[PDB]
Symmetry: C3
Amino acid sequence: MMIRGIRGATTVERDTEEEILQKTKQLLEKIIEENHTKPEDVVQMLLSATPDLHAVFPAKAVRELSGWQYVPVTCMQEMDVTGGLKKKISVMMTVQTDVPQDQIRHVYLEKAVVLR
Amino acid sequence: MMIRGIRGATTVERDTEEEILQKTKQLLEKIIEENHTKPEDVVQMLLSATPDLHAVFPAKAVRELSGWQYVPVTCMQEMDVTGGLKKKISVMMTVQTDVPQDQIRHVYLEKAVVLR
Amino acid sequence: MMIRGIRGATTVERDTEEEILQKTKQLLEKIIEENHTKPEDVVQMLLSATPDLHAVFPAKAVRELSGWQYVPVTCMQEMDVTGGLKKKISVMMTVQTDVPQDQIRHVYLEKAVVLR
């Protein structure tokens, strides 16, 4: 019985609830489809954003997913490193899976493509 | 063998070591009793606070619990979203348990009741 | 099948990429050797720094380790408590192991020695 973390990241152009929820939602849908993740297999989820996003808690996008209301999620503030990717939201999803570490499909979207 | 995250949250009226330790302690006692959590089953713990609390590390309350000295705990700063719940402390306890996701008893106290 | 978190912490004298990468690297090498940690057993890793470090993402040190490219890592900002240890970087490594909680070797280096 193994537990694995699945990373993910994306960026928004403007700090607005609308775009934040849309792209956070898109990121999670990509992770879920790429890894075939069932909500019950998920231990917890950690969402984070750089200190320039204040419009809404990215976790709000999880409400539009099907069957994820029982997945515990908390939202943290990412480290502010001078010169780093701005307006970025990250995902650290902990899931149960027998799929090898080297095979986990981590998702990097938008301007966060320069990290993957 | 499954691992589950248990969420929790509370708020303090004033930024003081005394009230922070008291309510953080009360929150953890509620989580522990509601979920029947033994310290040895706990993988790790993540404590967080909004950027308006600076009086003390909430982790200091763990010292008054019985048999929890070996549980790894780190304290993070929560995301600052305009209009969110102020003076809030959160808990993301990762524990070992066969109890189904839909049955985990997440604890929301004080002004954090508006989230549960 | 049990999952355990291994804590760690250190401090840097100056906010520079060079010293940050060196000491973060030294910290992880100490944790890995003290606990005999294989990269494949690691679920995920959480790196954090106090709000006074901006020179680089501590995760950059992981690139010099052997066989750790598939270990998911995210970097968070630690809670700013007045009077706390400044210029500190922490580690919350989640690993698979049958070694008892009371036996896990948590690593505290540099000025972070006052915490262990």
